[PDB]
Design a protein around this ligand. Sequence first.
Ligand SMILES: Cc1cc2nc3c(=O)[nH]c(=O)nc-3n(C[C@H](O)[C@H](O)[C@H](O)COP(=O)(O)OP(=O)(O)OC[C@H]3O[C@@H](n4cnc5c(N)ncnc54)[C@H](O)[C@@H]3O)c2cc1C
Length: 292
Amino acid sequence: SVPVNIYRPKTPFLGKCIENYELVDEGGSGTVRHVTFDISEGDLRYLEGQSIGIIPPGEDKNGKPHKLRLYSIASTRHGDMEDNKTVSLCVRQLEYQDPESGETVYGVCSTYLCNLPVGTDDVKITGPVGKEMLLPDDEDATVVMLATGTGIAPFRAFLWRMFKEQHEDYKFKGKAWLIFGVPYTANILYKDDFEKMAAENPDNFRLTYAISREQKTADGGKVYVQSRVSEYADELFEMIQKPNTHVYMCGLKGMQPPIDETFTAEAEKRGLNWEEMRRSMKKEHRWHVEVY
Ligand SMILES: Cc1cc2nc3c(=O)[nH]c(=O)nc-3n(C[C@H](O)[C@H](O)[C@H](O)COP(=O)(O)OP(=O)(O)OC[C@H]3O[C@@H](n4cnc5c(N)ncnc54)[C@H](O)[C@@H]3O)c2cc1C
């Protein structure tokens, strides 16, 4: 029932870019783009929380095709057009500077996607992958979603499924809480969507921001997702102690250490053992991490 590898890296589906738009508003930092593809010519089917591979064009030193890179799917199974014909991604352009030359280097695949013109054909896409970030079957589940940057992507999908679509079988009746961390208001990816869902589902959907360059801690420091987890540690632990409660974390690897440590420290403070809680959560399949 869970699709995987409908397309293999050997023979990827060839998609067409039908949209590509900037998500960071003026005054924000960096470039993150929402990139959508028509897939209606193939059998690509997918579930919310899964990922697809992209093979950027060209070759490596040995005349060899590049490795695929994985991108979390930002759309529901039906796609943003709600016609089952498309798939979308949330792509951040990777940049760094060489420590010896000083030269700026741009990630190969993220650059390819960010500069991908609308109309472009021949996009090499590989079949859906992942089971760790799926939405629970329990329609009454409490879903806690921790996100930094492009980590918002599967949660956009979740939320659209939860509050923006009507299904013939499913209907979410639980609580959903998104804690999303970004440096500036301009950098709130999909701000208008989320805020609209919040205004329309005021008792089932809670939207908490952590805006690092605009909001201050009591010590005067920058507010990060981990700062919110600390501020609301009591509430999170109360929630975690319900069996219907799932915690999801997505974004760059660097969000994990400090989040895992806040939980740990806030657990000790309360004579609880966070390794324990996490173990059991993992055994109950209620704790999900996709960090990259
Ligand atoms: C399951 C999963 C989901 C993902 N979802 C998303 C997503 O939704 N959005 C998204 O944007 N990305 C996502 N990624 C990341 C994505 O797969 C790529 O790794 C990313 O886009 C960078 O690839 P690139 O081809 O542009 O960079 P590359 O050309 O691959 O360059 C990256 C590499 O260069 C080196 N490098 C990187 N940073 C530095 C640095 N700071 N200093 C020196 N060397 C460095 C490292 O070897 C690094 O691996 C996801 C990854 C996984 C595995």
